Design an enzyme around this catalytic site. Sequence first.
Site, PDB file in Angstrom:
ATOM      1  N   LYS A 179     -11.360 138.113  19.146  1.00  0.00           N
ATOM      2  CA  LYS A 179     -10.924 137.485  17.838  1.00  0.00           C
ATOM      3  C   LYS A 179     -11.563 136.040  17.684  1.00  0.00           C
ATOM      4  O   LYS A 179     -12.147 135.813  16.797  1.00  0.00           O
ATOM      5  CB  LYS A 179      -9.379 137.177  17.872  1.00  0.00           C
ATOM      6  CG  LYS A 179      -8.725 138.807  17.620  1.00  0.00           C
ATOM      7  CD  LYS A 179      -7.424 138.618  17.441  1.00  0.00           C
ATOM      8  CE  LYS A 179      -6.522 138.125  18.769  1.00  0.00           C
ATOM      9  NZ  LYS A 179      -5.124 137.833  18.501  1.00  0.00           N
ATOM     10  N   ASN A 180     -11.473 135.324  18.995  1.00  0.00           N
ATOM     11  CA  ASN A 180     -12.231 134.056  19.196  1.00  0.00           C
ATOM     12  C   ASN A 180     -13.632 134.457  18.851  1.00  0.00           C
ATOM     13  O   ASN A 180     -14.130 133.272  18.073  1.00  0.00           O
ATOM     14  CB  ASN A 180     -11.822 133.485  20.615  1.00  0.00           C
ATOM     15  CG  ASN A 180     -10.492 132.759  20.695  1.00  0.00           C
ATOM     16  OD1 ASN A 180     -10.470 131.758  20.280  1.00  0.00           O
ATOM     17  ND2 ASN A 180      -9.488 133.659  21.196  1.00  0.00           N
ATOM     18  N   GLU A 198      -8.201 139.345  22.742  1.00  0.00           N
ATOM     19  CA  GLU A 198      -8.100 137.883  22.501  1.00  0.00           C
ATOM     20  C   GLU A 198      -9.355 137.114  22.456  1.00  0.00           C
ATOM     21  O   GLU A 198      -9.582 136.426  21.507  1.00  0.00           O
ATOM     22  CB  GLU A 198      -6.974 137.370  23.396  1.00  0.00           C
ATOM     23  CG  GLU A 198      -5.719 137.650  23.131  1.00  0.00           C
ATOM     24  CD  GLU A 198      -5.121 137.283  21.694  1.00  0.00           C
ATOM     25  OE1 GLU A 198      -5.769 136.225  21.474  1.00  0.00           O
ATOM     26  OE2 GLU A 198      -4.486 137.934  21.003  1.00  0.00           O
ATOM     27  N   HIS A 228      -5.457 143.521  26.367  1.00  0.00           N
ATOM     28  CA  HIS A 228      -5.016 142.244  25.707  1.00  0.00           C
ATOM     29  C   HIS A 228      -5.998 141.093  25.838  1.00  0.00           C
ATOM     30  O   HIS A 228      -6.328 140.232  24.993  1.00  0.00           O
ATOM     31  CB  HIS A 228      -3.728 141.978  26.359  1.00  0.00           C
ATOM     32  CG  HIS A 228      -2.543 142.765  26.139  1.00  0.00           C
ATOM     33  ND1 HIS A 228      -2.363 143.461  25.220  1.00  0.00           N
ATOM     34  CD2 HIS A 228      -1.500 142.898  27.023  1.00  0.00           C
ATOM     35  CE1 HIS A 228      -1.139 143.865  25.249  1.00  0.00           C
ATOM     36  NE2 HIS A 228      -0.630 143.887  26.379  1.00  0.00           N
TER      37      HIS A 228
END
Lengths: 350, 350
Positions: free
Chosen positions: A234-235, A231, A227
Site C-alpha cells: 500500500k505504501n 502494508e 500482513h
Amino acid sequence: PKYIEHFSKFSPSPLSMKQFLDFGSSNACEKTSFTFLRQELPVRLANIMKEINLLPDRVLSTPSVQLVQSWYVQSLLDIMEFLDKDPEDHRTLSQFTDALVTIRNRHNDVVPTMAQGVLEYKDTYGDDPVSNQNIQYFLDRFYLSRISIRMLINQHTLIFDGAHPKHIGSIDPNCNVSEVVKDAYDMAKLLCDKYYMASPDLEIQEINAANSKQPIHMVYVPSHLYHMLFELFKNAMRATVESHESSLILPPIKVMVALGEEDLSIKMSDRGGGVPLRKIERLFSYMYSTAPTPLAGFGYGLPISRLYAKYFQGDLQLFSMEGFGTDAVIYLKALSTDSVERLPVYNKSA
Amino acid sequence: PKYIEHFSKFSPSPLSMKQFLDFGSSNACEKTSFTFLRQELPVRLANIMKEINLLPDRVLSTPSVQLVQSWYVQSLLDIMEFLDKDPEDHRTLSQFTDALVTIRNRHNDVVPTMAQGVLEYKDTYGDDPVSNQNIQYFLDRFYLSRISIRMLINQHTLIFDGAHPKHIGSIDPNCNVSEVVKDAYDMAKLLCDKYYMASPDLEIQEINAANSKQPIHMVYVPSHLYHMLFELFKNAMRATVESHESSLILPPIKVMVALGEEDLSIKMSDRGGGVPLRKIERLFSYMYSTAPTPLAGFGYGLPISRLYAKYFQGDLQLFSMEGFGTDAVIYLKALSTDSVERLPVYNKSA
Ligand SMILES: CCNc1cc(F)cc2c1NC(=O)[C@@]2(CC)N1CCC[C@@H](NC(=O)C2CC3(C2)CN(C#N)C3)C1
Ligand SMILES: CCNc1cc(F)cc2c1NC(=O)[C@@]2(CC)N1CCC[C@@H](NC(=O)C2CC3(C2)CN(C#N)C3)C1
Ligand SMILES: CC(C)c1ccc(COc2ccc(CC(=O)NCCN)cc2Cl)cc1
Ligand SMILES: CC(C)c1ccc(COc2ccc(CC(=O)NCCN)cc2Cl)cc1
C-alpha cells in the site's frame, strides 16, 4: 497484585516452529496444549501487565490504558480458573477452548485503543523525543507480547475443534512465498485502483541459491507474511502514484525473493520518489504515525509489520534514495529450527 | 596535564562547507586561518587526548596507545608555540605552515599503530562483545577527530603556499560525482585484475530529480568520496569474483547516483552472493577486522569509509540479500549549507 505478581516471577517460554508443529501434529496432544497454555498464558499476560504498571501515573491513569489493563486483568482471571481443573475431562478441554475465544475477542480493539492513549499524551504532555522513545519502547514490547499471546491462542483453537491437515493452525509448513506476495499485491491493487484509478504492475523474481530451479517455500505463518507485504505494497503504491501525477506510465513495483543458507529475504522496490534518510526512522514511530484517510501513511501498519518480522527472529528494513525510490526488505529465518518466538521479558534491566 | 586541561575546556567549533570555501577564497585570509587554527587545533587535539586518558589503565599503558599519545602531546606543544606570535610577521605564517606539515607527517602511521593495540587487547584480554563495543566507540571518535584535524591542516597548507583556483584545497565546489565513481572503479579494477585475472564491469546511472538532463555535481571533498567508493568497489569485486568461480560471465557492478532536495545518494550493487543479516554489522567492527592479504575484508577500510560519510553529516549503509548480492549506499548532504563538520565532543556524558 499477587496473582499478577506470582506469574510475573516466571519468564515466558519461547517456542520454535518445530515445537509448534508438534503440538498440532495430533488431536491427542490437546491435553498437552491445555496443561501448557493454562500456565504459559498467565505467565505472558502477567509479564506484560507488570510492565503496564511500571508506566508513570500520568500515563497509567488515562482511560485507554485503564481500559486495556482491565481487559488483561479479566483474561488472566478467566484462565487461572482452569488451573485446578482436570485435563482428562473433555468438558474441561472444550470449556478451555471456549474461554480462549472469549479472551481473544475481548482484546480485539487494543490497537486503536492504545493509539487513542498516544493521541492524548501528545496533546496533554507533548511530542518531545524522549516521549517518542518511551512510547516506542513500550508499544513495541506490548504489541510483540500481544502477537505472541494471539499466536498461542490461534494454534490451540484452530487445531483443537473436533483430520490430518496440510496447514497446522496458522502455520503452513510449505508456504509458497511468491503466492503470498501476489495475494497481498492483488489486494493492495484493488484498494489502489479504487483510490486513484490506477496502480503499478507487479514483477516477481526468485533466487533460490542452492536449487536454482525450485520455487521458494518455507515454514511460516502466512497471515503474518501477508500482513507485512500488504502494508508495504500500500505504501509503495501510494508513493508511486502520487510521485507520477504528470506521467502516463507508472513504474512497476518489483519484488525479489531470495533463499540463502540462513536468510530468506524479500525485497520490494518502488520508484516512488523516495524520502531523505533523516525522515525514514519516523515512519516507524507510533507517535508520529498517530494523528486525529489515505491509502498509506497513517496508523501503525509499518511498525507492527516490523514486529511480525521480528517475532520469529527476522527483521524489516527500509532503504530509500531521495529523488528515485525506496526498497523494503523482509528478512526471515530460512530454517525452521532457527524460527523461535522473540518475546519481551520483564527483567530488572527493563 | 594543564595544557591539555586548558584547551579541553573548549568545545571544537565545527565548520560548514561554506565556511571552508571562504577561508580559501583569498590569499589575504592567511592571517585569519592562522589565528583561527592556532586556537582551534589545540582545542581539537586536547579534546581527543583527554579521551585517550579516560581509557582504562590496561589499555592506556600499552605501547601503541602510549606511542600515539606521545605524538599528540608533541603536536600540541608544536602549536602552542605560536600562541604569542604576531600574525603580521610573514615568517610567523610560513613557520606555521611548516609546523603543520611536520604534525601531519608525525601522525601518518596512526591507523596500523592503533590496530596493533587492538590486536594485543584481543590476545591479552579477549574479544567479548563489551570489549567490541568500547573499541568501536573509542576508535570511531578517535578516527573521526583525526579526519577533522587533517581536514583543517590540509585546507591551510594546500591553500597558503605562495592564484584563483577551481579547487579550494581539498574541496571541489563542482565535484562531478560520476567521474569520481569511475576513477575509483578503474583503480579497484586494476587491483582486481592483478589478483584474479578478471573483474566485473561497471554500469552507472544518474537520477537528477529536479533537472533530469544535468550531470550531478556537488560541493565535496573528492578524496574522501574516492576513499569510500574505492573501498566499496574492492569489496564488491572480491565478492563477485569469489562467488562465481564456476561461471564464465561476471555480473557487473551497478552504481546509481541520485540527487534529491536534501540527499545525494550513491548506491553500489553487486551480485556477489550476499551475507546473512546477522553478519553485516561485524563488517564495521574494528575488532573483528583486526587479525595477524586479500583484495578486501581485512583492515579498517569499511568503518573508516563510514566515518568519512558521517564527517559532513552523511552516512554509509550496507544491505545484503543472502544468496543474491549486496547494496551499499553513501548518503551525502546535497546542500553545501547542510554540510557541516561532525565532531566528537568531550562532554561529561562521554
Ligand atoms: C517498496 C516499499 N515502499 C515503501 C514502503 C514503506 F513502508 C514506506 C514508503 C515506501 N515508499 C515510500 O516512498 C515511503 C517512504 C520511504 N512512503 C509511502 C507513501 C506514504 C508515505 N507515508 C507518509 O508520508 C507518512 C508520514 C506521515 C504520513 C505521518 N504524518 C505525520 N506526522 C506524515 C511513506
Ligand atoms: C556493493 C558493495 N558490496 C560490498 C561492500 C562491502 F563493504 C562489503 C561486502 C560487499 N559485498 C559483499 O558480499 C560483502 C559483504 C556484504 N563482502 C565483500 C568481500 C569481502 C567480504 N569480507 C569478509 O568476509 C571479511 C569478514 C572477515 C573478512 C574479517 N575476518 C574476521 N574475523 C572475516 C565482505
Ligand atoms: C498510551 C500509551 C501507548 C503510552 C502513552 C505515553 C507514554 C509516554 O511514556 C513516558 C513518557 C516519558 C517518560 C519519562 C519519565 O517520566 N521517566 C521517569 C522519570 N522518573 C516515561 C514514559 Cl514511560 C507511554 C505509553
Ligand atoms: C588499542 C585501542 C584501539 C583500544 C584497545 C582496547 C580497548 C578496550 O577498551 C575497553 C574495554 C573494556 C572496558 C570495560 C571497562 O573496564 N569499563 C570500566 C569499568 N570500571 C572499557 C574499555 Cl574503554 C579500547 C581501545
